[PDB]
Design a protein around this ligand. Structure first.
Ligand code: SAH
Ligand code: SAH
Lengths: 174, 285, 285, 188
DNA sequence: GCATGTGTTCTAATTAGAACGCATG
DNA sequence: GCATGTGTTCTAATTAGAACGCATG
């Protein structure tokens, strides 16, 4: 089980991936506007491609992050026949409106999973080809409460880092 | 030697089916012509003028990866997404990422879905069109997503109207110099009906704004007729664009509805110049 | 004489030059075609569709006898004066002696001025058309001033629409029965564009009123398209009347303006039938 | 047909009078013997060409609009158009020996546009014959002495006023027939 | 008988024209 | 350069639809 090479877009995840126990093997790019195919190729192969919209209330159209993610994700795929395991994950902090969410599902060719935090408090949506993210039956949470959470957030991460958790099988730990 | 086969075309944002019109003009056999369009006036023109050849499949956002593979393989993927949120003629344009501007990425998506897999060397051509008069970053971003720079072609050199457009794609010899043909009406006088005098050689870019048919900041009338001045007629606009006369005379459409369709459409002789080399790769009439 | 000569025509209330179209279609050579017309749309259609052959002379009331003698001689004098004050479809009709009804007498006047002098054997033909749905008194008076009883010809026999019209004149064989020719379209279906289904075999009398295109007391839509109700298109009304497709597609006219012109005109195959035996009397290029 | 002919060779005038009868006027002037030549027809709606020919050759065709009052059953233009129709019916063959005259008289019932129509159909402008402004009439005819003489000028503004007083409701006016005496026999 | 009609005049819906805009080749 | 533009919006004119109409074959 080889280590992991991660391409990080917009948001750095070195601090979250160090507790994960997953030179450096993480390429982090802030804005990807002038990032062409050869640039992504030159950054070596990748096993995990991560991308996520900025926190609620932080400069760019929300769809931009999604479209640019898709573009670089296509740049970073391996050969058609599968040499090893390839993983990608796009995370939204509820910035995306109803329109943007359906665009997100159309381009990534799958429905999103809703990630809640209660004991609503903080929530996150996730598009991913990880079979482990999908089949976990998370506690059901709807939009109406997520919306109220957003409305109450604009007036002003854990299990999402456990969305990283089931990647431990794939690579060396610690 | 394997014989050439009829072409298989996916047309996104088809409009008034200019693509099919040009292909049939060149004498290229077409097996299937699958078009994505929303405007009912557009679809009607398409259905009537091509006698129901076009398979209409509706909104581009409803076209899936699976549908492309099931309807394919496609030899030619063409499209020109809306520019009402791109063109700098609109002071209230919302940009490439909002409004109708984001529809561009739908083309980008379906194009990727229509490409042959690895190890597949079969011929695959594509074309994307939009305006020169757009934002700098928007042109760049489009070039970034299509991974190509556009060729600039103005219809002024092959017709009687200014129309500077950008063309992304891989069509054989897109860059090559343009040439006049026997049936290229370069002068406005050649586009007018009998008994009407052209005041100018060329006219400026025709849009969905009715008065774009007038010339200059002073908004001059383009034509003289019998002791009075006049604008262009629908038929004459059609000739200016290189469409067959009365092409858009369908479904009781007014002058404005017809110019709305033409205002968005391609310049036919330009598309013919771009599609012409495809005659070598596919079966002909 | 020695040989046939090109025909000389005086056309009063010419409209969209139906007479000249029919003369041209029969191969009859035309020396001169003088038209009296006041409507700008009508004059434009006639000027364009016949490339300035027509000599327009304006208002019929401005046509003096001196003008008739100078412009003449005429071999054929044709016309159909306005009926908007004669037809019983107008509840506020003013009759033959008021409004536009008295414009009939202008035809009676010019016909009288156009007739060859006593002792002149040369062939001379005239035709006057109006509606059947008029007062019995106005029909009587027209017959008296023209010294002839009309022939009733309905275009339903020779075209796809009801159009019962009276025809006064001296054309050879006006009284003979109408035989359908190969080229005539007798059913509404033959007049529709592609992918359209006729709900009726023959449509009723098409007037300038928009909804005269609807059928019956119930005002039903005439055609089906994509399992939806629709009215007739302009191109279809032209086929129903017998005009070439897009004949009225001039001067950016709307559907209303086009139907206004068509609703006042003659059924082309009816005029073709009436004019047909004239090619024996005149040169035939 | 203009030239005057010797007295003995002149014949008693044959007259077609429409709408209004003028027998009394022509008799008093002496165009018709007091022993009864003049055909009078009130309604010409059914009158055809053969009827007029049957009614024998005519030398003078007269037409007049009814005087101001309720006597206008038909539209004012009806009288003019009908007059024109029957006048064409009664014209002599082109090499005609005798003089052929015609006359249309308006008693101011005709509006401006209808006057325009009247002048267009009879191919001449009317003559205003004022007898006084007591009375006045507009006259169309091919009689030379009528189009020649210069009567006193009258104003349309003044004439619209006479129309109003006559709507509210002679000798010299009857001299439209005077210049015809030298063309036909005279009884006295 | 009873449906029909070369029209005219009402509406709410579109058309045709003009003002507005300023970054981009 | 600086003047041109796959547009949007607002106003008066037309459109497209519908009511109204009754003598006529
Ligand atoms: N969501 C959508 N799906 C499919 N077509 C769409 C669409 N949104 C807009 N369109 C169509 O895209 C077209 C862009 S204008 C392009 C017209 C075409 N190139 C021609 O030659 O005529 C318009 O006709 C518009 O109706
Ligand atoms: N005063 C006038 N002088 C000449 N033409 C007139 C006129 N008043 C009306 N008209 C014209 O008379 C026509 C009567 S409708 C007849 C049109 C013609 N028979 C055709 O087949 O097209 C109308 O077109 C109208 O424009």
């Amino acid at each position: 089980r080889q280590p992991v090479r991660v391409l990080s877009l917009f948001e750095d995840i070195k601090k979250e991936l160090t507790s994960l126990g997953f030179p450096g093997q993480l390429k982090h790019v802030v804005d990807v506007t002038d990032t062409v195919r050869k640039d992504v190729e030159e950054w070596g192969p990748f096993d995990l491609v991560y991308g996520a919209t900025p926190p609620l209330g932080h400069d760019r159209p929300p769809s931009w992050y999604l479209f640019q993610f898709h573009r670089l994700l296509q740049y970073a795929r391996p050969k058609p026949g599968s040499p090893r395991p390839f993983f990608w994950m796009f995370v939204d902090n509820l910035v995306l409106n109803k329109e943007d969410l359906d665009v997100a599902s159309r381009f990534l060719e799958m429905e999103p999973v809703t990630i809640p935090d209660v004991h609503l408090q903080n929530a996150v949506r996730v598009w991913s080809n990880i079979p482990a993210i999908r089949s976990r039956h998370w506690a059901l949470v709807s939009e109406e409460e997520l919306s109220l959470l957003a409305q109450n957030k604009q007036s002003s991460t854990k299990l999402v880092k456990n969305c990283f958790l089931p990647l431990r099988e794939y690579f060396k730990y610690f | 030697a394997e014989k050439r086969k009829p072409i298989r075309v996916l047309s996104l944002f088809d409009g008034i089916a200019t693509g099919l019109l040009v292909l049939k003009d060149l004498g290229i056999q077409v097996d299937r012509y699958i078009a994505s369009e929303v405007c009912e006036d557009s679809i009607t023109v398409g259905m009537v003028r091509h006698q129901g050849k076009i398979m209409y499949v509706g909104d581009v956002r409803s076209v899936t990866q699976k549908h492309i593979q099931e309807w394919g393989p496609f030899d030619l993927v063409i499209g020109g997404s809306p520019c009402n949120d791109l063109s700098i003629v609109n002071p209230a344009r919302k940009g490439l990422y909002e409004g109708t501007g984001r529809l561009f990425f739908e083309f980008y998506r379906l194009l990727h879905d229509a490409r042959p897999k690895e190890g597949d060397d079969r011929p695959f051509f594509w074309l994307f069109e939009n305006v020169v008069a757009m934002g700098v970053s928007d042109k760049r971003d489009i070039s970034r997503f299509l991974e190509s720079n556009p060729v600039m072609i103005d219809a002024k050199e092959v017709s009687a109207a200014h129309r500077a457009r950008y063309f992304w794609g891989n069509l054989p010899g897109m860059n090559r110099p343009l040439a006049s043909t026997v049936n290229d009406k370069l002068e406005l006088q050649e586009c007018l009906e009998h008994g009407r005098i052209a005041k100018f050689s060329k006219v400026r870019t025709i849009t969905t704004r009715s008065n774009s048919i007038k010339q200059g900041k002073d908004q001059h009338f383009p034509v003289f007729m019998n002791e009075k001045e006049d604008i262009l007629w629908c038929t004459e606009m059609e000739r200016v664009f290189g469409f067959p006369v009365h092409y858009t005379d369908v479904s009781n459409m007014s002058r404005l509805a017809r110019q709305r369709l033409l205002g968005r459409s391609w310049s036919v002789p330009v598309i013919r110049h771009l599609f012409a080399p495809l005659k070598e790769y596919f079966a002909c009439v």
